[model samples]
Target: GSSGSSGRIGDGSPSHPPILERTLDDVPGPPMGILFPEVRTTSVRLIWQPPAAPNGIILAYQITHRLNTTTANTATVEVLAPSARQYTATGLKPESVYLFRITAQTRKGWGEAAEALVVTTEKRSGPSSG
Candidate 1:
C-alpha cells in the first residue's frame, strides 16, 4: 500500500511588501507671531499667523497647552478652519503659568508644532468696597 502527503510542495520564499506613494508633499509648517490679546484670571485670547509653508490646503489647527509646573495633564483645542487665526482658552486657573503650542493640519496630515509659548493668567482682583 502507498500513501500520499497532503502538504504544500513549493519553496518557502520571502517577498517584499508593496510601497505606496504619498499624495501631499509634506505637512504644514508651524504657526508664527503668537500673541495674547486679552488675558484674565479665567480666560486668555490667543492669536497667531498662518504657517509659513502650507504644503497643502489647511483644514484645521490644533492648540495644545499644559501647566508649566506639572507634566501630568494637557489640554487641547481644535480650530476648524485655515482662515481662523485666533482662539480663546477659558476656564484657566488664576495666576497659573501655561505653555502652548500650535500645529496646522491639512488633507494629508498634521504638521510640525510651533515653538512653545509661555503665558501666565492674571491674578484675581479683590472685591472693591465703597
Candidate 2:
C-alpha cells in the first residue's frame, strides 16, 4: 500500500565497490510537470498535471500557492483522489499575482515538487443587479 519500494542502486563506477554493494533506493522519483493558475469571475482555476505515480498509485496530490514577495503568504490544498489531476481554488482576489507549486504522494510518502512562475488572475467586475 505504501507504494514505496526499496532497491539497490549501482554507484557510478566501472567496477562495483567491494564494501558498498548497493545504495538505498530513493522513493520513486516524482514527475516533472507544469500548472497554470488562472482566475475566473470569482474563483481561481488551477490547471495542472500531477506527477505520474512512480509505482502508479498516487494517493493524493499536494497543492501549494502563495503571494509573490519576500514573505509571501502560502496556502496548501490536498486532493484526496489520484484521479484528480486538476483543481480549482476558489474565493480568490481578482487582479492579484499568486505563486504556486505542486507535489505528488502515495501511501508511503511524498515525491519531489514541481514549481511554476508567478501567475496573475484577472480582476472580476462582480455580480450585476439587473
Candidate 3:
C-alpha cells in the first residue's frame, strides 16, 4: 500500500504590516501685530494676534531683536506662551532702532518670523525743576 506522506497543504500566512503616521500638522507661522505705538524705554510692549496658519499646537512664540547700533548684529531673544496674544518685550533702550521679529514654534518646527520695528521713547520729567 502506497502512503501519501510527502503531500501537505500550504501553511497559512498573512501579508505586510500596517504603516504608521508620524504627524499631519505643518510648521507654525508668525504672530500678527496688534499694537506698539507705545514703545517704552524700559520695556518694548506690543499686542498681537496669531498667524494665519499655526497648523499645530504652538509651544512658544520666539522673539528676536537685531539692534541697529550693535555692530556685531546680536540676536537678542525672548519667548512667550502662544495662549496669550499680548506682547511685553523685555530689555529695552532709548532712541535706538531694533528689528522686532516673532516666530512661532510647534511640534513640527519653528515657523517664519513676523517683522516689525521699534524706535524707543520716554515721557518723563526731571526732578520737578527745583
Count clashing pairs, candidate 3: 0
Q: List the residue pairs that clash in candidate 2.
A: none
Q: What stretches of model 3 exceed 4 Å from their correct place?
A: 1-23, 123-130
- From the highest lDDT down, the ranking of the candidates is 3, 1, 2
How much is the lDDT of residue 50 in candidate 1?
A: 88
**Model 3, CA-based lDDT:** 0.71
| Per-candidate local distance difference test | 0.71, 0.56, 0.71
Q: TM-score of every model?
A: 0.66, 0.55, 0.66
Query: Taking the tens digit of each residue's C-alpha lDDT, what string does model 2 give over 5-120?
Result: 68877766466547623244333344465545456633666566644435545766776766554353446555545666666666555455555566666655777766654444
Worst 10 residues of 1 by lDDT: 121-130
Candidate 3, residue 54: Cα displacement in angstroms equals 1.4
Tens digits of per-residue lDDT, candidate 3, 1-130, equal 6755566577887799665433587887667764565677757776677876677888888777767676774686778777767667667667677777877878878888788777677763223232
